[PDB]
Curated annotation (Swiss-Prot):
This is DNA polymerase alpha catalytic subunit A. Its main location: nucleus. The CysA-type zinc finger is required for PCNA-binding. The chain holds residues 349 to 1228 of 1468 of the full protein. GO terms for molecular function: 4 iron, 4 sulfur cluster binding; chromatin binding; DNA replication origin binding; DNA-directed DNA polymerase activity; H3-H4 histone complex chaperone activity; nucleotide binding; single-stranded DNA binding; zinc ion binding. Catalytic component of DNA polymerase alpha, which in complex with DNA primase (DNA polymerase alpha:primase) constitutes a replicative polymerase. POL1 has a role in promoting telomere replication during interaction with CDC13. The gene is POL1. Belongs to the DNA polymerase type-B family. It is found in: Nucleus. Changing L486M: Increases rates of C-to-A transversion substitutions.
Length: 829
């Protein structure tokens, strides 16, 4: 009742301070944005005494020397016993250190860090020199991801015009900030962004043509988000792709045909200026999109830079009048943009995190994700604003904007359906890192912080920053068994930890041995055990829970706990990990091979056949032709594996009634859920083949994988093909089915070997005729019969459809290159 309370979401570093962005509740129960500037943070350094020396000896040497370099009056320092258990060979298991608190903000040389290998006759190592300020705050104050923060001694008059937030305060010391236990959170303001660009061939520059903004101002993660939730506001901005003016009637047609507002601008600079202004006023907590992180945010940033947009900083929540000096270095561009966006969470459904939640996808194209996650179909329009029709054709312009609007709302809907926010929040609360790092990073970040918190809290010093596939058709049900928990069960079962495994820190290639049963449970195994235990606690509560809201919540919690545990191996296995330890990785890997090798023998002891296997999954031929019998075999195998390995709990992930297998991610099959056809890795190049070819291939699979005898079905195939061969020769198939699309990456006159490419020959024939066609143009053609080359015989579809042109499809080409070659692979085995 006397403290400033904020729910923190994101952060940024500046002038050796730490700024937290979050939300504050007002007297009308509404929540607005807020920022907190944190001063007084210090790096925690630990100086390691020399043989015979003490911490007091160290205090006498460096403290006075540190006061000089940094120009400090006094420096807090004191002896402290700390444990060490990582890869530096010359440091003991436990020692008395001198803990020195060195402020980030210092009068002198504040940007100069103390090296770990600092020369001295009292100590021979220094930990914590290069500490990151966010890390220091989070670890010292035990902050575990986004949560409510009690902030005492908040100064409401110190900060002036620093942010795009409604409330700005500061604090003199980080100890004034403590986390609360409150489990609920405020509603989030989400803004879905969809951007349409244009490639300027002159400068090879990506330019922005339009932007759609869909606002959802009350997304509550405390309850499930309702499907097909409608936006509170929808607006589209657009500039002319070619000239300074749009086609006539555009505004009247927009109001008539397009949902939400449409705003027209005379140029891109004006458009982007309005965009920034809208962002500021909307003040969203989350920006949702598809491929924002490493495609469109880059384009957006550079264009605001190119066009010198003064209000560019409103993409984030800190106010800057000028860009960073070095903005313009390849890799550094990522940091600058991420830094500028600080304050607003980037919810990208198609980045690494987004993909990890949607393993059933293959391309992660927007329309594909929409199909997989929402079971809805959207046929994507290929909009090319280079085409001249968009400068005078009002209907084309309108359809293109509709495509943008649709994509914007699809991106949002998908992000909610795959529960990208709640899952990432839970993952962040479990690992103790930043929500932004979880949304936009790899697993390593979570892996890193979960250990940083775990070890630091128990007085530890942390480090400074397969079975080849059986190719063919499998007639018996094949089950895919999930072995994701393999490594975390090994680490737990054999008590493998940085603190338990005696290892030679000189030669990291030397294989160590697991600790004897006498050794107490280590930090890493205990962490895993706790995660597994809590997961069970949740699943127990679920069985009883009646309320669908709380139940759905439990399922999210349960998932997060699982993902956290199954990512732990990365901590010690990933080469570039802060906690990388080769002796441990090898130790866990070898035990993993044994278990898998023995898992094979176990399968065979039940008269099962291992079709494929690796550390993540094992595929088993059940030998049954019935779902029930297959599942029972599957569970029997599950029980058998657990009896031999008490901590290894595998499960059935995929059920294949039939399986045409080539590799782990290259197969066709009838999956059960209601049987359904599923193809992976064999649907790469659909574009190069016509509808007839794709209709043939699909029909062939269906019949082959059908529950019909393998001769009658295979005869049904020949009766089908032969019939297709006669229909092609007599040309009694729709001309549509022969069509082949091909996009031009470069201008037709500059295509090397154009004489061989049918699309180019047809494109050039349009030029010499008169019609215009450039790079990016999609050529639809059909190979015709009359020696003339295949490319020469290629003609535009619309031409071939006109009977009076006397053009017919060439049987030779379509029977050999379009029907034979593809099938020659389908029926190889």
């Amino acid at each position: 009742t006397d403290t400033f309370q904020m729910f923190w979401l994101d952060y940024c570093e500046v002038n050796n301070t730490l700024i937290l962005f979050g939300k504050v509740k007002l007297k009308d129960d509404n929540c607005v944005s807020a920022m907190v500037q944190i001063n007084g943070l210090c790096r925690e350094l630990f100086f390691l005494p020399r043989e015979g020396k003490t911490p007091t000896d160290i205090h006498e040497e460096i403290i006075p020397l540190l006061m000089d370099k940094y120009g400090l009056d006094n420096i807090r320092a004191k002896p402290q016993k700390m444990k060490y258990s990582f890869e530096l060979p010359d440091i003991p298991s436990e020692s008395d250190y001198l803990k020195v608190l060195l402020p980030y903000q210092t009068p002198k040389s504040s940007r100069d860090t103390i090296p770990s290998d600092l020369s001295s006759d009292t100590f021979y190592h220094v930990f914590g020199g290069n500490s990151n300020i966010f890390e220091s705050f989070v670890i010292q104050n035990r902050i575990m991801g986004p949560c409510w923060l009690d902030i005492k001694g908040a100064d409401f008059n110190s900060i002036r015009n620093a942010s795009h937030c409604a409330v700005e305060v500061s604090v003199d010391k980080p100890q004034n900030i403590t986390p609360t236990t409150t489990k609920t959170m405020p509603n989030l303001r989400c803004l879905s962004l969809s951007i349409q660009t244009l490639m300027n061939p002159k400068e090879n520059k990506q330019e922005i043509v339009s932007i759609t903004l869909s606002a959802y101002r009350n997304i509550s993660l405390d309850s499930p988000i309702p499907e097909n939730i409608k936006p509170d506001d929808l607006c589209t901005l657009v500039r002319p792709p070619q000239s300074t003016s749009f086609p006539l009637g555009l505004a009247a047609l927009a109001k008539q045909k397009l949902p939400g507002r449409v705003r027209l601008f005379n140029n891109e600079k004006a458009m982007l200026s309005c965009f920034c202004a809208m962002l500021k006023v909307e003040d969203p907590d989350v920006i949702i999109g598809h491929r924002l992180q490493n495609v469109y945010l880059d384009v957006l940033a550079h264009r605001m830079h190119d066009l010198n947009i003064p209000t560019f900083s409103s993409i984030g929540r800190r106010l800057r009048r000028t860009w960073p000096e070095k903005f313009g270095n390849s890799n550094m561009n990522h940091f600058f943009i991420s830094d500028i966006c600080s304050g607003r969470l980037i919810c990208d459904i198609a980045n690494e995190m987004g993909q990890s939640l949607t393993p059933k996808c293959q391309s992660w194209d927007l329309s594909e994700m929409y199909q997989v996650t929402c079971e809805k179909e959207h046929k994507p329009l290929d909009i090319d604003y280079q085409n001249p029709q968009y400068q005078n054709d009002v209907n084309s312009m309108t359809m293109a904007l509709q495509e943008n609007i649709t994509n914007c709302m699809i991106s949002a809907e998908v992000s909610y359906r795959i529960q990208l926010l709640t899952l990432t929040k839970q993952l962040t609360n479990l690992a103790g890192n930043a929500w932004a790092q979880t949304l936009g990073g790899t697993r390593a970040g979570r892996n890193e912080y979960i250990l940083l918190h775990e070890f630091s809290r128990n007085g530890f010093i942390v480090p400074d920053k397969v079975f080849e596939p059986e190719k063919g058709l499998h007639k018996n049900y094949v089950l895919v068994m999930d072995f994701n928990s393999l490594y975390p069960s090994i680490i737990q079962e054999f008590n493998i930890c940085f603190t338990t495994v005696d290892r030679n820190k000189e030669d990291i290639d030397e294989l160590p041995s697991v600790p004897p049963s006498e050794v107490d449970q280590g930090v890493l195994p205990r962490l895993l055990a706790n995660l597994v235990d809590r997961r069970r606690e949740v699943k127990k509560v679920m069985k009883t829970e009646t309320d669908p809201h709380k139940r759905v919540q439990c399922d999210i919690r349960q998932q997060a706990l699982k993902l956290t545990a199954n990512s732990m191996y990365g901590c010690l296995g990933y080469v570039n990990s802060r906690f990388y330890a080769k002796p441990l990785a090898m130790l866990v890997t070898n035990k993993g091979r044994e278990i898998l090798m023995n898992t094979r023998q176990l399968a065979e002891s039940m008269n099962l056949l291992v079709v494929y296997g690796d550390t993540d999954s094992v595929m088993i031929d059940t030998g049954c032709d019935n779902y029930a019998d297959a599942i029972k075999i599957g569970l029997g195998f599950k029980r058998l594996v657990n009896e031999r390995y008490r901590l290894l709990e595998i499960d059935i992930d995929n059920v294949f009634k039939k399986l045409l297998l080539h590799a782990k991610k290259k197969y066709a099959a009838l999956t059960v859920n209601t049987t359904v056809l599923e193809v992976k890795g064999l649907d790469m190049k659909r574009r190069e083949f016509c509808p007839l070819s794709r209709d043939v291939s699909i029909h062939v699979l269906n019949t082959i994988l059908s529950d019909k005898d393998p001769e009658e079905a295979l005869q049904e195939v020949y009766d089908y093909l032969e019939d297709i061969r006669i229909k092609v020769e007599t040309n009694n198939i729709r001309i549509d089915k022969y069509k082949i699309n091909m996009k031009l990456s470069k201008d037709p006159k500059a295509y090397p070997g154009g004489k061989n490419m049918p699309a180019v020959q047809v494109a050039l024939r349009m030029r010499k005729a008169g019609r215009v066609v450039k790079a990016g143009s999609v050529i639809t053609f059909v190979i015709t019969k009359q020696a003339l080359s295949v490319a020469e015989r290629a003609h535009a579809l619309n031409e071939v459809m006109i009977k009076s042109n006397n053009l017919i499809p060439d049987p030779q080409y379509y029977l050999e290159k379009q029907i034979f070659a593809p099938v020659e692979r389908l029926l190889e085995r």
